[model samples]
Target: ETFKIRKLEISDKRKGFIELLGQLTVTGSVTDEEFDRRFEEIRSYGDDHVICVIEEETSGKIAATGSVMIEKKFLRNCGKAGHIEDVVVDSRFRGKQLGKKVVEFLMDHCKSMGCYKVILDCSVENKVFYEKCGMSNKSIQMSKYFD
Candidate 1:
């Protein structure tokens, strides 16, 4: 087994998990109560969900994380769709192909789960990065954020 990649376990909850997530956002901090609440939501996704992480062997730090959620849909003859999300790599780990590895792991995980297609929405600038992962633009993503 590759030491760099592994399934995120419940035991990882206390090991700088939130700090790793902060690299993807303006995350000041998440209270323990809130983290537990959100962790429950992550757990509810069930078996088709894949949360993969790369841990730095020397530092015992989570270097990057990515997830793919297999969505059961009625269309395409009831085939499942894989939605990739929450891809984040520590700044120090960037440019080392960690993001590519993480996304590839999730994509392969989705395929193993029998997903008909894998998709993710990203900024135009980041399109090339996904392209390197063999993902291409198929549609536009429109969204509105709410307060």
Candidate 2:
């Protein structure tokens, strides 16, 4: 019950943030300098890009994490959209409702920021999980990866 959610900080690089991301996908090695540079670049966007983390108070490690990027669009009366990304929870912390908490936090942040809609892409295996988070299946997700 000691977990708390908050925005990402530069110091989180040493708090196993990257490792927690590895649980989601291929997160290669990142040096502290590289991490700081990227962190600064994202921070420069102000509230447009928000990366959130769930920290375990006692161990001082990240238990869950997610991010929401606000997109300023020309359609829908020039409304804004929110893109939720990179959501993950530590394997040790699975089944604790942490993932849902991260999603709810990001979604609420988007709503507070006045975004008209929120979206995300996930594998079919995870569809039910997102459904439980109050997200529904809409369109197909297509991607082209550069290697």
Candidate 3:
């Protein structure tokens, strides 16, 4: 399948966009409210720390999605660092390089916005994928889940 990569925009409230987001979430769920909230959030604060992408094929079906965030910092050379998150490809569309394409698209977009580096987290079992993707495993950080 051939795909055209594009930045997720509020105006493109097409069926393909919703399908893409639903397929790309670990939970495999999406609510109208959630979509509305995210759409508005992107319109308002996307430039600061949000980006979303859709992998739409020649048939105009969105099969994959990935996003990046640029966060401001104080004393870092990159000044504004980046984080890659919410990466998911439909079960029917895994194994192909679509996820990789989404990431590459996000990287190019982030770089265009003057970001220095991008970071992402994956389960230990999937370390091979990141390694194959050429992401360095320099250091690991700790976190606290507040629920």
Question: Which number leads on TM-score?
Answer: 2
- Model 1 earns a TM-score of 0.88
RMSD (Å) of each candidate, 1 decimal: 2.4, 0.9, 3.0
Q: Write the per-residue lDDT of candidate 3 for residues 1-147, one digit (tens) a residue.
A: 766667776545554666656654444455667777877876686666655555555656667777777887776774876788888776777887777787777777778888777789877876777777667787776889784
Higher-ranked by TM-score: 1 or 2: 2
Residue pairs clashing, model 1: none
What TM-score would each prediction reach against the true structure? 0.88, 0.97, 0.77
Tens-digit lDDT track for model 1 on 1-147?
Answer: 123888787656676766998888766778877877876787788767878989887777788898888899999899999998888988877877888888989888888888889999888999999998898897999989784
Deviating ranges (above 4 Å) for candidate 1: 1-3
Better of 2 and 3 by TM-score: 2
lDDT of 2 by residue, 16-131 (tens): 99999999999899999999999999999999999999999989999999999999999989999999999999999999999999999999989999998999999989999999
lDDT of each: 0.83, 0.95, 0.70
Worst 10 residues of 1 by lDDT: 1-10
Error of 3 at 26 (Å): 6.2
lDDT of 2 at 53: 99
